[PDB]
Design a protein around this ligand. Structure first.
Ligand SMILES: Nc1nc2c(ncn2[C@@H]2O[C@H](COP(=O)(O)OP(=O)(O)OP(=O)(O)O)[C@@H](O)[C@H]2O)c(=O)[nH]1
Lengths: 81, 87, 536, 97, 80, 72, 80, 77, 94, 48
């Protein structure tokens, strides 16, 4: 690929693993990042959604638009990458 | 500071305190950034105003949500050739 | 005292690598990334030299001579002298696909001689997927068919790599157009094998399918369509969607420079296709300029390739200079990482298929489900089929694939021989695992634990392991079954009898027989009722 | 060039692989940007040096090199390839021995 | 374009109000093409919060609402 | 038959329009000029809030992003 | 189907469509599309503004609705 | 101006999709079109109201930046 | 570079940004209505396609409600907050 | 230059009077290859 910035490269290395991301509406999604994009659209699988009141539900697949993601907690091994 | 290459490479790995537009305070070792001002914080923690601390992992913050950031703490820290003479 | 027993290369230290060892060891916890592969070939097709290119990319310190192949995975000194590969060796490396996402690969370089084909059988048991190496001049000879056919019967996933393409331009001197037909015919030959022998829907191997790549390991060339389209996309600068060009770079399609559309009727009597214009003619022009000119053209090669060559590199010969020019322009093999990553499926997806083939036990409720999950938290099950000897040949380390639970050094484990069953049960022993290693042919990386999906080299359990072995959790109270023996693709037809002049030394000979019997797998040792000691 | 000693690229019974080319109607509109161009478009495929350069690749050493370290006149053993390879069939007793 | 005026204001002291209502005052050690402004010897007065002294502060440029400029500034020479 | 925005606003340029901002307020006046980014300049412009006029403003420039809709 | 080709069907057929506004959850616009641009601004015809909290209606007529404000465009139901 | 690669959405095409939009609208139906902006086309679309009502929509185009979350009801093809 | 500056200058002589052009060269006060419901009345000295402005002798007035005001000698205003620039009828060309 | 004593030594084709390295083109290499012929083998050696 073209030289996209290091945070986007680390996001694609995060595809193997579990990531936890919060959306601008406040819901926290934990799941296994199956595809990511350079606009940081995220596809999660085996997802658990946690609502802002602390309720939770399972979701088989979730697509989140990249500009609606606030942050992602990435796994630690990516610090080595 | 940033983008000035001689200066930017020294401002990475500082422990920096990040303020977000929702009012959150994140703290972590700031060690990557992007032209969109995305930032990647290693060993991150969050402080929420009410103060309460929570431990996070490696946190990627999408740049759109940063208000500002400041230095919190230093990076972590730790001639040599001769032998011609004898004594 | 300092007995010169050395029969294999072994590295005095861990060599440098581009990836951190810690990232490799962490990625081992994540089979949703990692792949296992075997590379299988006719004798002296690309296979070993191609892995030397993967070594050279990951390592930096890896010296390849300008004259002769380094053949890192051919560690034995008989293999150095013979220069055919004689035994399998595994590699483990971290390598990037076209996205620059980092994958973990485990790769066995199977020997290409049919007499060694028992080594290919043991490798395919580990493999999950095969890459088949065809030589652009010879095409599909004998063992290439046997390698494909035997891989199908294993239920491996089969991928093609056309190898030593340079033979077309340099030796055969076929032009651009006929070189395309030669590559096309090789692909047709392999699909003709696949469609007859598969009977099931084993996937067709075009490049448009991108399960096929082209390579020259002598010249550091490796490209699919998409990596070549990415070269145009990087070079011109994303002015077009590179995947849409890659779709159009093979087959009966032509570029109409009047309109810049792609048409399927030959736009003139002589028009080169897409593959001929974009992929082959630049390659012919890279080689023919350096081969014919060297002295005069080389500055222009810097300009179009944007490569830099220092003046003492510009004084290299042709082979190292072309290999350097291709190395800098193409960069890494990531086209091959794409081939492995997409087509093969990991351990986890393949674990359903592989347990059905290998396991022998009741392929239903308790233990077979833990393996089909490939759950690193499950009960320990390991399968092994190789024995590699320690540098003093006192003992073997066994080579193994795990897929249930996690294997841990200095723990106790139940080792099941090839006969074990609820009636046979005397064929089991409790062994204490020594050190665990990850093996990169000449050198070994030492680890405290290995999780399901990985391969592992295991110290200390080698005494009862005659050839294949299953290793199992001691505390697992339900019935454990051994994985199948190796169903070899050939027979030991030649018998040789051995008798020492020394016969008080005959006890030493029998220990020789036991050690070779472990190393070989297809070698069969008998003591006849005549008392002859026999090798097969 | 296709040397006539090279056997033709054909196997008569061989089934041709299916080519999954893109289907016409939308896909024929797709166009390559006007400056995208084969990597070496105007460099000629071969020159009058190229035939000689290819021949050098399998010259006996040293002639397959083009850059080399220099060697002493006592070290170039001019006839040594002759005795290595074999006796010609006709040469008598003295020379064979 | 006018952002290239601000990067001539290096080492000037300004008071900045951000869109979030944070008031920041300090000396511009540098400001970039996106008007990410980097300040030294900084006080942040978050809205309805006590001012906090800070050594350094990087503001992502879109958060800037306005920058009060120092009174002596030779606008007639910087706007060329 | 298509009536595209730039032809549409050019047909309105030099004529009376009502412009509604995204935040509950309306400006009526002669649309004097439009640009490729569709900033709006109104002349003789008058400010309407909750359907009631509250003053003449003269020439006003409404920046592009503020507009919900504009029309005759 | 793409999106632009679908809006061309509303344009070519002059289908009565209801437009949902962006954050303005309590109003919707109903009418006919008569044109659009690459920014998805909609020149909107016979347009009415519907206050679904009351089902009250205002009639505005021909307007340019800026595409930034559009959540959704769909063929109107039988409601009028 | 900028160039954007087509989103991955092709694996979701012609499967049934739920969407949550800006303003917390819930829309559901068969996703059978998109563009580089992720302007969705939803066929046989159905609205779910915040009062618990539901209304059938037509063939529906959704402006991409109003989409917050999109979520299959069925396994990806 | 300079062709883009030439393009930027050409648009100002005809587009809606003429009001900012007249505000500079004739020194006529603009009452900039701005987000946060605040009014800034001042003279623009420079502006751009993004509708930035540098402002001199600003009077800021707003409703807090009760009216409050502040005097700002010079300011740079980021144009993303500008709603509505009124060429002030309570002032004149200078 | 063929029959000079140290041929080319003062030229870009060889490093200098120490006469330790050389880098000939193809027009040179193919010409002296052709002259050498009477001494050279015919073989693509290694298999023979
Ligand atoms: N001409 C040419 N020869 C090559 C190329 N790659 C490898 N070879 C040659 O083929 C021979 C065998 O290469 P290896 O890497 O040992 O092939 P191999 O298949 O691994 O040998 P085995 O696996 O034991 O069969 C060596 O002489 C190589 O120089 C190539 O790209 N071009």
């Amino acid at each position: 690929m073209t030289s996209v910035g290091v945070p986007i490269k680390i996001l694609h290395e995060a595809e193997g693993h579990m990531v936890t991301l919060e959306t601008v509406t406040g819901e926290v999604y934990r799941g296994k990042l199956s595809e990511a994009e350079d606009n940081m659209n995220c596809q999660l699988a085996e997802t658990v959604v946690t609502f802002r009141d602390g309720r939770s539900h399972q979701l088989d697949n979730v697509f989140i638009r990249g500009n609606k993601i606030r942050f992602m907690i990435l796994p630690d091994m990516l610090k080595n990458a | 500071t940033i983008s000035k290459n001689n200066k930017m490479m020294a401002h990475l790995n500082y422990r920096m305190k990040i303020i977000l537009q929702d009012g959150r305070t994140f703290i972590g070792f700031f060690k990557a950034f992007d032209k969109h001002m995305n930032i990647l914080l290693a060993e991150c923690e969050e402080h929420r105003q009410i103060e309460e601390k929570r431990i996070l992992g490696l946190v990627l913050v999408r740049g759109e949500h940063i208000v500002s950031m400041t230095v919190d703490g230093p990076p972590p820290r730790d001639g040599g050739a001769g032998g011609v003479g004898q004594a | 005292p300092v007995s010169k027993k050395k029969f294999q290369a072994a590295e005095r230290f861990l060599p440098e690598t581009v990836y951190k060892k810690e990232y490799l060891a962490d990625l081992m916890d994540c089979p949703h990334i990692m792949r296992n592969v075997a590379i299988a070939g006719h004798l002296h097709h690309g296979k070993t030299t191609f892995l030397d290119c993967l070594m050279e990319q990951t390592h930096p310190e890896f010296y390849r001579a300008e004259d002769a192949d380094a053949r890192f995975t051919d560690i034995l000194f008989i293999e150095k002298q013979r220069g055919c590969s004689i035994k399998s060796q595994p590699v483990s490396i971290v390598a990037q696909d076209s996205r620059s996402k980092s994958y973990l690969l485990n790769i066995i370089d199977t020997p290409g001689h049919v007499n060694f084909s028992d080594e290919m059988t043991a490798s395919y048991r580990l493999a999950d997927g095969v890459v088949v190496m065809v030589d652009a001049h010879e095409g599909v000879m004998m063992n290439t068919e046997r390698a494909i056919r035997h891989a199908i019967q294993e239920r491996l996933a089969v991928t093609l790599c056309i190898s030593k393409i340079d033979r077309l331009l340099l030796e055969l001197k076929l032009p651009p157009a006929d070189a395309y037909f030669k590559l096309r015919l090789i692909i047709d030959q392999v699909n003709n094998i696949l469609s007859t022998f598969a009977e099931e829907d084993v996937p067709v191997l075009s490049p448009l399918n991108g399960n096929v790549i082209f390579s020259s390991g002598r010249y550091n060339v490796c490209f699919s369509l998409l990596s070549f389209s990415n070269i145009y996309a990087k070079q011109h600068g994303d002015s077009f969607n590179s995947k849409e060009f890659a779709r159009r770079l093979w087959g009966d399609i032509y570029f109409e420079k009047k309109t810049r559309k792609f048409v399927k009727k030959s736009p003139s009597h002589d028009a080169p296709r897409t593959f001929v214009q974009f992929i082959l003619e630049p390659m012919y022009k890279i080689f023919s300029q350096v081969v014919g000119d060297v002295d005069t053209c080389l500055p222009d090669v810097m300009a179009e390739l944007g490569i830099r060559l220092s003046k003492e590199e510009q004084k290299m010969n042709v082979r190292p200079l072309i290999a350097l020019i291709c190395k800098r322009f193409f960069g890494d093999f990531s086209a091959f990482v794409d081939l492995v990553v997409q087509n093969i499926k990991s351990p986890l997806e393949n674990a359903k298929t592989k347990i059905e083939q290998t396991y022998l036990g009741p392929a239903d409720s308790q233990l077979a489900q833990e393996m089909q999950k490939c759950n690193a938290e499950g009960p320990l099950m390991v399968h092994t089929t190789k024995n590699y000897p320690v540098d003093d040949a006192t003992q073997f380390h066994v080579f193994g694939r795990v897929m249930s639970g996690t294997l841990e050094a200095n723990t106790d484990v139940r080792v099941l021989g090839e006969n074990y069953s609820i009636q046979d049960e005397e064929d089991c022993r409790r062994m204490t695992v020594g050190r665990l290693f990850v093996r990169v042919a000449s050198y070994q990386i030492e680890v405290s634990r290995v999780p399901a999906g990985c391969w592992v080299l295991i110290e200390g359990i080698d005494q009862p392991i005659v050839k294949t072995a299953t290793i199992a959790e001691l505390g697992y109270e339900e019935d454990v079954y051994i994985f199948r023996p190796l169903k070899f693709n050939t027979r030991s037809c030649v018998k040789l009898a051995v008798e020492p002049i020394n016969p008080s030394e005959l006890p030493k000979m029998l220990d020789g027989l036991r050690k070779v019997n472990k190393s070989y797998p297809l070698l069969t040792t008998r003591v006849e009722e005549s008392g002859e000691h026999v090798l097969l | 060039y296709y040397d006539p000693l090279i056997n033709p690229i054909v196997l008569s019974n061989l089934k041709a692989t299916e080519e999954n080319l893109p289907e016409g109607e939308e896909e024929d509109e797709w166009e390559l940007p006007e400056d995208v161009r084969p990597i070496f478009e105007d460099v000629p495929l071969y020159t009058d040096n190229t035939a000689n350069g290819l021949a050098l690749l399998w010259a006996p050493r040293p002639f397959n090199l083009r850059s080399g370290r220099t060697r002493r006149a006592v070290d170039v053993p001019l006839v040594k390839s002759w005795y290595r390879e074999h006796c010609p069939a006709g040469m008598p007793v003295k020379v064979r021995v | 374009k006018l952002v290239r005026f601000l990067m001539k204001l290096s080492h000037e002291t300004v008071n900045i109000e951000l869109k979030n209502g944070t008031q920041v005052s300090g000396t511009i050690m540098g400001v970039d093409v996106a008007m990410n402004t980097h300040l030294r010897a900084v006080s942040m007065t978050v809205k309805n919060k006590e001012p906090v002294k800070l050594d350094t502060l990087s503001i992502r440029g879109n958060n800037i609402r306005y920058i009060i400029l120092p009174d002596p500034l030779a606008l007639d020479t910087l706007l060329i | 038959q298509p009536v595209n925005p730039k032809p549409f606003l050019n047909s309105l340029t030099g004529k009376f329009v009502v412009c509604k901002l995204k935040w509950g307020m309306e400006y009526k006046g002669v649309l004097v000029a439009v640009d490729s980014y569709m900033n709006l300049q109104l002349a003789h412009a008058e400010e309407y809030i909750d359907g009631n006029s509250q003053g003449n403003l003269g020439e006003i420039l409404i920046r592009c992003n503020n507009v919900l809709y504009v029309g005759g | 189907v793409q999106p632009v080709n679908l809006i061309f069907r509303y344009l070519q057929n002059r289908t009565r469509v209801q437009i949902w506004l962006y954050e303005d959850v309590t109003h919707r616009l109903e009418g006919y599309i008569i044109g659009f641009d690459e920014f998805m601004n909609v020149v909107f015809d016979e347009a009415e503004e519907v206050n679904m909290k009351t089902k009250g209606r205002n009639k505005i007529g021909r307007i340019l609705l800026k595409g930034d404000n559009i959540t959704l465009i769909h063929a109107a139901q039988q409601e009028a | 101006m900028s160039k954007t690669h087509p989103p991955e959405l092709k694996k979701y095409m012609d499967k049934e999709m739920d969407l949550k939009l800006n303003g917390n609208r819930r829309v559901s139906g068969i996703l059978r079109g998109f563009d580089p902006f992720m302007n969705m086309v939803i066929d046989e679309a159905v609205e779910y109201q915040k009062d618990g009502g539901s209304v059938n929509l037509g063939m529906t185009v959704i402006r991409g930046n109003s989409v917050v979350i999109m979520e299959p009801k069925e396994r990806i093809s | 570079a300079e062709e883009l500056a030439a393009k930027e200058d050409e648009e100002f002589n005809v587009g809606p940004l003429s009001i900012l052009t007249n505000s500079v060269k004739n020194n006529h006060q603009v009452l900039i209505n701005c987000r946060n419901n605040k009014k800034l009345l001042g003279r623009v000295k420079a502006f751009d396609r993004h509708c930035n402005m540098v402002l001199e002798n600003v009077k800021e007035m707003w409703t807090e409600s009760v009216a409050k005001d502040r005097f700002i000698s010079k300011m740079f205003l980021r144009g993303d907050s500008v709603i509505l620039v009124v060429k002030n009828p309570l002032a004149q060309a200078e | 230059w063929f029959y000079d004593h140290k041929p080319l030594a003062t030229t870009r084709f060889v490093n200098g009077p120490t006469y330790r390295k050389w880098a000939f083109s193809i027009p040179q290499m193919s010409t002296l290859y052709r002259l050498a012929n009477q001494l050279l083998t015919d073989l693509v050696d290694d298999n023979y």
